[PDB]
Amino acid sequence: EGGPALFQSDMTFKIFIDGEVNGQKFTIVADGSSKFPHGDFNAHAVCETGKLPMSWKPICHLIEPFFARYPDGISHFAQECFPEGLSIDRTVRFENDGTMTSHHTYELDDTCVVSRITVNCDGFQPDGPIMRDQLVDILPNETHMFPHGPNAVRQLAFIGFTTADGGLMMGHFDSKMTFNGSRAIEIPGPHFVTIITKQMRDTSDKRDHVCQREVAYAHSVPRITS
Amino acid sequence: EGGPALFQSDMTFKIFIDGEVNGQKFTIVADGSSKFPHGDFNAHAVCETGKLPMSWKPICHLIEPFFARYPDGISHFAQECFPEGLSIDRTVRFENDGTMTSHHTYELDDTCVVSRITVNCDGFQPDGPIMRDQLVDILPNETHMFPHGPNAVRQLAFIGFTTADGGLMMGHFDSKMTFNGSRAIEIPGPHFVTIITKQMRDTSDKRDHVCQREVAYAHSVPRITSAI
Ligand SMILES: [Cl-]
Ligand SMILES: [Cl-]
Ligand SMILES: [Cl-]
Ligand SMILES: [Cl-]
Ligand SMILES: [Cl-]
Ligand SMILES: [Cl-]
Ligand SMILES: [Cl-]
Ligand code: NA
Ligand code: NA
């Protein structure tokens, strides 16, 4: 049948990101695979238009929620959306800096998931650490998942980036995942997805290449009285 | 001799909250105890001024980070701040509703910690579930702890409140904890404090009485250090 049964195989993915920042256009293409049982996977991304005009760091979350590792007591909404598919409407607001707004669609073709993302990054500080490429690491974080009506789940996160000058650049992440289909789908109750990410420069062309690894797994926390 | 050493026994605390919401003043007083190794404690709170003019739920975080339970390998800043103590500046912004800003000061006296808090709850919706007292549960959540430069730690949280409708009202919690002393205090690496909270009514004669339990413990998530 559908949902998690479609993810019971090694999978591949391809992502096409159509973006702009402060009016400068860019294109990123990324691909990779995720081996069953998922939860730990790599992606290789390339800026097709040459040099990325901003830090690659804030792009980390654009470069597959359905590859997170879930325990059986929590419905894995992102996988349950297949085969009809998944759309995401996401905004990351960077403190003292710009806002990135992304619209994602995800389609499954046999064992390859194709992603299309359009992203607008508005109001980024030309002399800030994103535009000057001064972000170094991405902090592991405990994203919060909430039910959001009949066919959607909301993921809220605090994503901190360490910077060359020691202060954190904090992103406020707010992401609505919506099922493309019309059957009833199980909506998980409140829970958490732990996300650990690392991005590394790859040998660079006339184009920026980056390799990225992500570890992602869900858990819950029981209520009182206990 | 200072810091965590001062939390190796059972302790008590006492809290004075001087508040208002959309003009209306209120005062709360609360106390309780926390027994070693901490991480699970109750507070009894009373609105001295009569009936609380809003839901008690949003007050949960006003009514003791030094009583969270930490494992060995994460520095416990809120305890590390003693004997000199610490202050907090905190904003909770509620979606489609008001914002509460508070300023807390903590002082140790033997094995009691005293807290004084002023809080302004501005812009709350008269028709909303906070003012109309329609919030029922407080969702357990994974608060994020970050070093915040010399002498300070930042705690960020998404704190959901289930409404009577069976909907959700999200508070965006942003809290700065600052050491009040003058020596060179260490600051913890990024980590999390899991917080589970339950409020329960006590029979209100003259004044609103609320009893609140909290489970709070820290953990860290390691970063990837291998290449590829
Ligand atoms: Cl351009
Ligand atoms: Cl590629
Ligand atoms: Cl700046
Ligand atoms: Cl690198
Ligand atoms: Cl709002
Ligand atoms: Cl831990
Ligand atoms: Cl790891
Ligand atoms: Na949008
Ligand atoms: Na939209």
Automatic annotation (TrEMBL), chain A:
The keyword Nucleotide-binding does not apply. One of its GO terms (biological process) is generation of precursor metabolites and energy. It comes from the Eukaryota. This is KillerRed. Belongs to the GFP family. The modification Cysteine sulfenic acid (-SOH) is found at residues 112, 211. Pfam families: GFP. Keywords: Chromophore, Luminescence, Photoprotein. It comes from Anthomedusae sp. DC-2005. SUPFAM superfamilies: GFP-like. The lineage of its organism: Eukaryota, Metazoa, Cnidaria, Hydrozoa, Hydroidolina.
